[PDB]
Chain A
C-alpha cells in the first residue's frame, strides 16, 4: 500500500532520481536541499511500504519503500516582495502516472495546504496550470476548491495558455478530517474499544466477529 508522510532530506536523492530534469544533477540536489532545509515542515512524499505480518533502484529509500510521489513546497522569499503578505508556492507536485487513481495528488496537496496555513500562517497559495490538462484543472479547481481568476495567454515557455488560480487559506476549512468522507469522527476522548463488551442483543449480533471462543 501507499504511505503519506512528511518529506525529509533523506528523500531528496530519490526525488532527484525519480525524474529526468533539464537542470544539472548537482543544481537539482542543491535546489532540493534549499527547499527541505528552508521549509522542513511543508513538503510531503508518497511511498510504498511493506508491513510486518540486485540492481538497487535509485528511488528506494528502504527495502519495500519506493518513492512514488511528492509535493515540494516553499514560502515566498523573493527580496523584491518583502512587504507582501505571506503566501505559499507549490514548486512541484509530482506523482508517478502508474500510481494514478489512488488519490495521491489530492492527499499530498491537502497536507501541503494545511501545513502552509498552520506552520507559516500563509494567507493564500497561487499557481498556474497548463490549459492542456483537465486532470490538473479538475484537481485544483474542483477537488481542492482553487478559484480560477483568469486565463493568462501564452503564459508558458512553449506558448501555451495557463489558468491563473488562487486559494485563500483558512485553517478551519483545511482541516484534514473535513475530507475523510465523500460522517463520524474521532472525538479524541472516548474509548475506541468501547463497543466490544456492550450487552444489547443487536450489539451481540453485529459485533459477532469480535467474540472469540
Chain B
C-alpha cells in the first residue's frame, strides 16, 4: 500500500503542475515496474515536460499491460487527459468513459466528454453528457445554456426553447448586473430558435414577434433585435411596418448598404427607378456624407445626362480631396455597367483634368492622373495607363500608391521581375510600412525570386499561410522550368558538360517538386488547426453567455475546407498528384515526391475534407471528374459531366472537351482540357497546339505567357 500512497502524492503533484517532482516518486515506484497507472502517469508527466517520444512509449506500454480492458478509474482518467493532449479525441472519449464505467465519481468527466464529443461532431452523445453534467449541477446557468444549445444542435428545437424558458423562471428575480448580458443573449437566442421553428407560419411568426417585443427592454443587442423584427414583418407581409424598422436601422448605421436595399423592397419600389430616385434624394438629406444615397442611383439611372451629372457629383469631390480609392469606389460600375458608365466617366475626368494647374492644384492634379491611369488600365489601354501614372510620378515621386499602380501595369504586361522591382522602390519610401512589405514579398514570389522574398520579409524577423501558398506556387513554376531545361537537354570532351548538367537539373527538379508539395501540404495543416481551435469554445461560450456566436462558430468550422486559400492549395496541389499518377506508367519533401499512392495522398491530405463540406452549388465538377477519372470510378465521371452541363449548359467548350475524354474510355479552355488528355484521346496534338496559340492573340501578355509556359509546357 506504500506504492499507492507514493502514486497518489505523484497524482497530486501532477495536478499542481509540479511535473518533475511527480516524476521522481514514479521513477521510484517503477524502479521497484508492473505498475500500470504509474506507467500511465509517468507517460503524462513526460508529455507535460516535453519528453513526447518517451511519453508515447510509456503510454503504449501501460495500454498493452491492460488486456482486461478493466483498468482503474484513475488510470483511465490519466489516459483520457493524455489522449486529449495529443489530440486523439476519439481515444480520449473511450478512456474518459471507461473511467466512469469503472466507477469514477468525478462528474467533471462529463463536461470534458461534452467538449470532446462536440469537437468530433458527435452531438448526439455530447447532448447525453450535457444532460448528465446539468443534472449534477442544476445551479449553474452555463449548464442550462449548454444543454439548450446541445438540444438545438440535435434538432430538438422545442426542447431547447423549453430549457431556456426553465432557467428564465429560476432567474426571474436574481439577475444581478453582472448577469444582465448573458440574460440578454439567452433571450435573443431563444427568439432565434422560435424564429426558425416558425418558418412561414403566420400565427407562429406573430408569436415570435410578440416575444421579441416583450424581451426588448432586456435585450442589449439592438441591431440584432431590429434586424429580426424587420425580417418578421416582411414574412408577415407587413411591409410598411418593416420599412419603419429598416429606416431605424439605417439611422443607426447609414453606412451599411444592406439596409437601403431592404428598404426599397419593403416600400415595393425595388423596380421603380423614379420612386427610388425620390427615396435616395430624401435619404441624401438625412445622410449627406454617406455613400449609399449617393452611390445606389449610379447603379440604376438610365438617362445619360442624369447619370453623367450624378457620376460627376460622386467622383469629382473625391478627386478634389485627393482620395486614392476614388477609382476603386466606382469600379463595380465599370464591372457591371461598363458600356454605359465608362465613356461618361472618361469625359468627366478628362474634362476635370483639363482645368487643373499642376502647381496651384497639385493634390487634385496627381490624384486625377492616378484615377485616369486605372481607368485606362481597366480598359486595357496600356500606353495611356503608363502615361497618366508617369505624370503623377513625375510630379510627386514620394507617394507609394503610384508605385503600386505602376507595378500592376507591368505585371499585366507579364514582366514579373520588373513589377516586383517597382514595388520595391515604393517600399524604400517607408521601410516600416508592413502592408507594402507584404505586397513586395508576394510580387517577388510571383517572379519566382524566393531568396529576395524571404530577405524582404526577414526585415520583420513565423510562416504565414498566404506566404506559404505563394511560395508553393513559385516552387512549382521553378519545377516546371527545370524540367523543361532538362528535356531540352536531351564530342566526348564536352560530353562531360551535358553529363554533369543533366545530373544538376535532375536534382533541382526533384528539389523544387518536393518543395512545392511540402509547401502545399502545410495549408491543410493550418486549416486543421483552425478546426481544432474550436475546442475551448464549446465550454467557454457557454460560460461567457454567447450561444448565438457559438453557433456561428460551428457553421464557420463546417466551412473551413471550402475556404479560398484551402481550395487554392487543393487545386494547385492536384496538378502534382494527378501528374505523378499518370507519369506512373524530409526537409525537401522527397518522401512526398516518391509516393506509391498519389491519389490516396491527395484525397487524404486535401480532397476528402473539402468534399464533405462543399455545397453542391459551389462544387468544382471538373476537379471531381479529373479526380474520379484516375480513381477508376467512371460512374462518378458521368455524374460530374451531367451535373456540370446542368449548370453551364452544353455549349461550353470545356463541356464538349470533357464528354469526349469519357466517351473514349476559338474557346481557349476547352481546347486546353483536350490537350492535357492527348495521350489517352487521339487528337491532332500538334494541330491542337497550333489552335491553342491562335486563340491566345486577344488576351493580355501575362495570360499569353503563363499559358505558353505552364499550361502547354
Instruction: Name A residues whose Cβ lies closer than 8 Å to a Cβ of B.
Output: 1-6, 8-10, 13, 17, 19-20, 22-26, 29-30, 33, 36-38, 40-41, 48-53, 55-56, 58, 60, 64, 96-103, 107, 111, 118-121, 176-177, 180-182, 184-186, 188-189, 192-193, 195-196, 209-210, 212
CA gap between A81 and B468 in the complex, in Å: 41
Given contacts A9-B549, A51-B332, contact A188 B568 (CB under 8 A): no
Residues of B contacting A23 in the complex (Cβ-Cβ under 8 angstroms)? 462
Q: Give Cα distance in the complex from A66 to B300, angstroms.
A: 23
Cα distance, A2 to B550, chains bound together (Å): 28
**22 A-B residue contacts at CB 8 Å?**
A3-B291, A4-B255, A6-B223, A9-B556, A20-B434, A29-B529, A37-B537, A37-B540, A40-B546, A53-B336, A58-B465, A64-B332, A97-B435, A98-B324, A119-B181, A121-B180, A176-B251, A176-B254, A180-B254, A184-B286, A195-B278, A210-B281
Instruction: Name the one of B283, B321, B462, B473 contacting A192, with C-beta atoms under 8 angstroms.
Output: B283
Interface residues as binary, B416-442 with A (CB distance below 8 Å gives 1, 0 otherwise): 000000000000000001110110000
Contact between A25 and B333, CB atoms less than 8 A apart: no
**Contact A25 B462, beta carbon cutoff 8 Å:** yes
A192:B247 contact, CB within 8 angstroms: yes
A102–B332 CB distance below 8 A: no
The residue of chain B having its C-beta at the shortest distance from the C-beta of A68 within the complex is B325
- For the complex, is B267 an interface residue (Cβ under 8 Å from A)? yes
**Interchain CA distance A185-B288 in the complex, whole Å:** 11
Is residue B163 within 8 Å, beta carbon to beta carbon, of the partner chain? no
> Quick check: A96 and B435 within 8 Å, CB to CB?
yes
> Least Cβ distance of B177 to chain A in Å?
8
- CA separation between A78 and B385, bound complex, in Å? 54
Inter-chain contact B329/A185, CB cutoff 8 Å: no
Whether the pair B244, A193 counts as a contact (CB closer than 8 A) is: no
Instruction: Determine if B285 and A50 form an interchain contact, defined as CB atoms under 8 angstroms apart.
Output: no
Q: Residues of B with Cβ closer than 8 Å to A?
A: 180-181, 220-224, 244, 247-248, 250-258, 261, 267, 274-275, 277-279, 281-283, 285-292, 295-296, 299-300, 306, 321-325, 328-330, 332-333, 335-337, 401, 404, 433-435, 437-438, 457, 460, 462-466, 473, 526, 529-530, 533, 536-537, 540-541, 544, 546, 548-550, 552-553, 556, 563-565, 567-568
B283–A2 touching, CB < 8 Å: no
Q: A50-B336, A188-B244 are in contact. Are A38 and B223 (CB under 8 A)?
A: no
By a CB distance below 8 angstroms, the chain B residues around A188 are 244, 247-248, 251
Question: Are the C-beta atoms of A101 and B256 separated by less than 8 Å?
Answer: no
Nearest residue, chain B, Cβ from A108: B255
- Contact A181 B278, beta carbon cutoff 8 Å: no
Q: Does B244 contact A97, Cβ atoms closer than 8 Å?
A: no
A41/B224 in contact, CB under 8 A: yes
Q: Given A6-B223, A56-B564, A60-B564, are A22 and B254 also a contact pair (CB < 8 Å)?
A: no
CB nearest neighbor in B for A10: B556
Chain A residues positioned under 8 Å from B330 (CB to CB)? 1
State in angstroms the CA–CA spacing of A210 and B276 once bound together: 10
Known: A38-B546, A48-B328, A188-B248. 13 other contacts (CB 8 A): A2-B291, A13-B565, A26-B530, A37-B537, A40-B548, A40-B552, A41-B220, A58-B466, A97-B433, A99-B325, A102-B323, A107-B255, A212-B274
* CB closest chain-A residue, reference B446: A55
Interface pair B568/A56, CB less than 8 Å apart: yes
**Nearest chain A CB to B147 CB, angstrom units:** 19
Total contacts A-B at CB 8 Å: 201
Name A24's closest neighbour in chain B (CB-CB).
B462
Complex contacts, A1 vs chain B, CB 8 Å: 257, 291-292, 295, 329-330, 332
Contact B251 A51 (CB under 8 A): no
Note all chain A residues with C-beta closer than 8 A to B324.
98-101
Chain A residue numbers with a CB within 8 Å of B462 are 22-25
Q: With the chains together, A56 CA to B463 CA distance in Å?
A: 19
Using known A-B contacts A40-B548, A50-B335, determine if residue A25 contacts B464 with beta carbons closer than 8 Å.
yes
Residue contact A50 to B253, C-beta cutoff 8 Å: no
Name the residue of chain A whose CB is nearest to the CB of B255.
A4
Asked if residues B546 and A4 are in contact (CB atoms below 8 Å), the reply is: no
B548 and A2 contact, CB distance less than 8 A: no
What are the residues of chain A within 8 A of B529 when measuring CB–CB?
26, 29
Q: Do residues B564 and A8 form an inter-chain contact, with CB atoms below 8 A?
A: no
Output the residue of B275, B325, B433, B540 with the most chain A CB within 10 A: B325
For the complex formed, measure the closest distance between the CB of B641 and the CB atoms of chain A, giving whole angstroms: 22
Nearest CB in chain A: distance from B112 CB, A? 20
Output the residue of A49, A52, A53, A96 with the most chain B CB within 10 A. Answer: A53
Q: A9-B549, A9-B552 are in contact. Are A19 and B299 (CB under 8 A)?
A: no
A41 — which chain B residues lie within 8 A by C-beta?
A: 220-221, 223-224
User: Which residue of chain A has its CB nearest to the CB of B224?
Assistant: A41
Asked if B564 and A196 sit within 8 Å, CB to CB, the answer is no
Contact A182 B289, CB 8 Å, known A4-B255, A24-B462, A111-B253: yes
Pair B296/A51 contact, Cβ less than 8 Å:
yes
Look across to chain A and name the residue whose beta carbon is closest to the beta carbon of B464: A25
Q: Shortest CB–CB separation between residue B155 and chain A, in angstroms?
A: 23
Given A98-B324, A186-B250, also A50-B332 (CB < 8 A): yes
Return A185 CB to nearest CB of chain B, in Å: 6
- Closest A residue to B544 by beta carbon equals A38
